[PDB]
Design a protein around this ligand. Structure first.
Ligand SMILES: *SCCNC(=O)CCNC(=O)[C@H](O)C(C)(C)COP(=O)(O)OP(=O)(O)OC[C@H]1O[C@@H](n2cnc3c(N)ncnc32)[C@H](O)[C@@H]1OP(=O)(O)O
Ligand SMILES: *SCCNC(=O)CCNC(=O)[C@H](O)C(C)(C)COP(=O)(O)OP(=O)(O)OC[C@H]1O[C@@H](n2cnc3c(N)ncnc32)[C@H](O)[C@@H]1OP(=O)(O)O
Ligand SMILES: [Cl-]
Ligand SMILES: [Cl-]
Ligand SMILES: [Cl-]
Ligand SMILES: [Mg+2]
Lengths: 427, 427
């Protein structure tokens, strides 16, 4: 059995955040009916297509395990169809602009009237009640709003976006938690709820560690493990040394560990020509003697200035600069194995090329080849949660309106009524 | 009333990923009993402390809504206590190293014997069956393993770690989806399941958009929305030109749009002295006329060299550069307000200082002042999902072993036999 078998999702979502959520629900067995606009549908269909007039990889990688119906929702017959669909839905999911779903006659209060059991789940930019509640926010804007950009990158460079979808997919995964939580409470109350996740808040949740640091900084005036705390290492734009003397908000720390276990990104053989020929090396406290054996400096093992975090904290960059010199003639996989024979936490920067074609990730179903007989096969990311009694069955993304009549017949409409709806341009 | 009221969680978790998961379950009403090592407890207690001998903000911000019991689980008496606790639990959660729980004698097989309803939830570095399934992984190593580091930062710099916890907290939130999914099937089956999330997999899930890009790159040889698509824009450290002629794995694109429309991080008034005086500004294809009005370039509206995404490919970075000149005398908030007049997606880089003291985030319960009469009040991030039917009630993190006797009483032990366990150094 799959977790969400028999869960009917009425899916209004577009682009990334909403569709990530509903696709992942689909992977876990939910019945996802994607409502799309007549003729055009989800904006991702035509977004950076790799072949003319074929749905893009943006669309296919976020819309597997879904059925598509075209619908003009601002028509009387379309609103009627929607009322029928809401009555059969367990969860409605949308990521329209604020007020958009109200404006086409479907307020939460009306939705409750139609179906007391339905859950209404929304992706928002800022939370309801926020001063900026009405600002449009997408991916990198949300990374900026939630504190990630300010704390990502280097002290002598700009705020930096993550390549990971901290705004979009992260918000979608957060909303999926909200939806599943609402399903849990419905078992007890018998009633549906409204649940919403703002992109700013999804980002903030993942930068909890930086709000820890902001309070530490306010309380103590220093973050001793940050590069700026090492005397005469970090320099500003003009060339002078940086310190916490004049830093009152969590700064960018380059490739520092971000917690209580210091680390850095270290060059390996080929770094000039291979952008991903690097490892990350972490100094775990219990693993310090093991590091001294690999690096071969046994003086440091018993030196109190070197064998304690508090001793090490004021010369982290000096130790990292040295260890990096030991990796100059070894590729990232050779450095990783050389550290691994001392049990040390060291790992390679995996390239997207490596990841896309990695045997292990395909063995465990995390990278999945989708059998798409219409467009040709493509890779996608599968379910990142692995269950003892269940395996996802990923099926290819729908053509625009491919399942319109199938879905209309399920509502109970006869073949003459379907032809009328097609002729009247509602589906 | 709350989604997880009456759900008993046996919580073995420590450090970041596991405790984030169980804390958020706590926020949604779960009864979380956190098992800790005697004397030292969860090592976050003593990491990055702001006051000597007070539990660190690292611990308190990850362990609200929990009770703490001290337990040596490598004693016959400890293992017997676990068996009793497992029988009362709905969910067991752990983020020890691979195999650790099995070596204690609590394999999934034996756990099922003890309690056929209980769900076992794990965070590990890599998935079971992966070549690296036995590796111990920390935050930035997981970012490196999952494709984030390789695709974050600039083309002429190193792979860059994200300030957001893509590895740890993100994995915890994913595990929460798995746990909630297992709770949903248990209503049908009456049986618990094992659910596991690999840190690599949680990262890769958020990097799905870069797997879209890898395939596009493999299929077409170019990513037209990336800075390197602009001829003579991007260069490596020795001045060699970077173009997609020689790029075979998704490159770092600086502050480019990712899964959003094209954008960039633009300087605002004060950028020389304020590290966070920037906005993110998006050039969405359907907003070009508005942008031309804003920056007073009417001649750009009807010029095919400027008015389509395709025409802008060879000059987009020049356009960003020119737009940025309009922000020289305006702070990030006035730039944001100006752009919002046109409906253009644009927003400020919010500093951690600005976020920690923002009234809106405290109004909507996303930043929360926790009442801690022992340690003094502190801020935390609350639930990122907002519900119509309930509000989290966040309560302070437990002192080490604060609830040991309280918890033992509930297990059916009386005063004479808990004293023996104290005596034997079991609790
Ligand atoms: S990971 C970050 C990704 N970044 C982006 O997605 C940036 C690009 N995004 C956008 O430009 C918009 O967010 C898009 C994807 C165009 C969606 O815009 P809306 O949220 O307004 O959704 P729609 O464009 O689909 O809706 C426009 C108006 O029309 C109504 N409507 C939607 N769908 C239908 C159907 N099927 N039938 C009739 N009407 C429909 C909406 O309610 C909306 O109404 P307004 O009253 O004009 O707001
Ligand atoms: S979010 C970033 C952290 N990453 C993860 O959460 C990924 C999963 N966790 C891990 O890989 C490890 O837990 C990390 C975080 C890398 C730390 O590694 P350690 O070197 O600390 O190894 P363990 O956590 O597995 O602990 C070592 C042994 O100690 C035993 N143990 C823990 N707690 C107790 C108590 N209370 N009583 C008795 N024994 C206890 C573990 O079972 C483990 O046993 P071994 O069999 O000796 O490994
Ligand atoms: Cl989106
Ligand atoms: Cl974290
Ligand atoms: Cl966008
Ligand atoms: Mg003008």
């Amino acid at each position: 059995t799959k977790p969400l078998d028999g869960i009917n999702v009425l899916d209004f979502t577009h682009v990334q955040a909403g569709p990530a959520c509903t696709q992942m629900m689909g992977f876990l067995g939910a019945n996802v009916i994607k409502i799309e606009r007549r003729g055009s549908g989800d904006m991702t269909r035509g977004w950076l297509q790799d072949k003319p007039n074929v749905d893009s990889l943006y669309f296919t990688m976020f819309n597997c395990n879904k059925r598509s119906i075209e619908l003009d929702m601002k028509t009387p017959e379309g609103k009627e169809l929607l009322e029928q669909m809401i009555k059969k839905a367990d969860v409605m999911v949308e990521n329209f602009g604020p007020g958009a779903l109200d404006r086409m006659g479907f307020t939460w209060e009306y939705i409750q009237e139609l179906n007391p059991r339905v859950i209404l789940a929304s992706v928002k930019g800022y939370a309801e009640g926020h001063a900026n509640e009405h600002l449009k926010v997408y991916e990198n804007v949300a990374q900026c709003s939630g504190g990630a950009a300010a704390t990502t990158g280097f002290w002598d460079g700009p705020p930096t976006v993550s390549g990971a979808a901290l705004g979009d997919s992260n918000s979608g995964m957060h909303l999926m938690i909200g939806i599943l939580a609402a399903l849990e409470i419905r078992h007890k109350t018998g009633r549906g709820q409204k649940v919403a996740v703002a992109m700013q808040d999804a980002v903030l949740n993942l930068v909890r560690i930086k709000l820890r640091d902001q309070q530490r900084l306010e309380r103590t005036g220093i973050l001793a493990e940050y590069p700026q705390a090492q005397p005469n290492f970090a320099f500003d734009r003009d060339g002078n040394p940086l310190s916490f003397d004049n830093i009152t908000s969590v700064p960018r720390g380059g490739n520092a560990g971000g917690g209580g276990q210091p680390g850095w990104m270290l060059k390996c053989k080929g770094w000039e020509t291979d952008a991903d020929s690097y490892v990350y090396f972490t100094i775990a406290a219990n693993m310090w003697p093991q590091i001294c054996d690999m690096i071969d400096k046994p003086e440091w093992k018993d030196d109190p200035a070197y064998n304690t975090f508090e001793g090490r904290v004021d010369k982290l960059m000096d130790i990292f600069s040295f260890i990096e010199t030991k990796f100059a003639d070894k590729d990232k996989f050779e450095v990783t194995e050389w550290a691994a024979q001392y049990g040390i936490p060291c790992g390679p920067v995996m390239s997207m090329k490596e990841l896309a074609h990695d045997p292990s990730l395909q063995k465990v179903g995390t990278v999945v080849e989708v059998v798409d007989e219409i467009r040709g096969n493509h890779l996608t990311v599968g379910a990142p949660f692995k269950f003892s009694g269940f395996q996802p069955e990923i099926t290819r993304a729908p053509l625009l309106g491919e399942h319109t009549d199938e879905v209309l017949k399920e509502l109970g409409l006869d073949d003459a009524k379907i032809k009328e709806l097609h002729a009247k341009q509602v589906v």
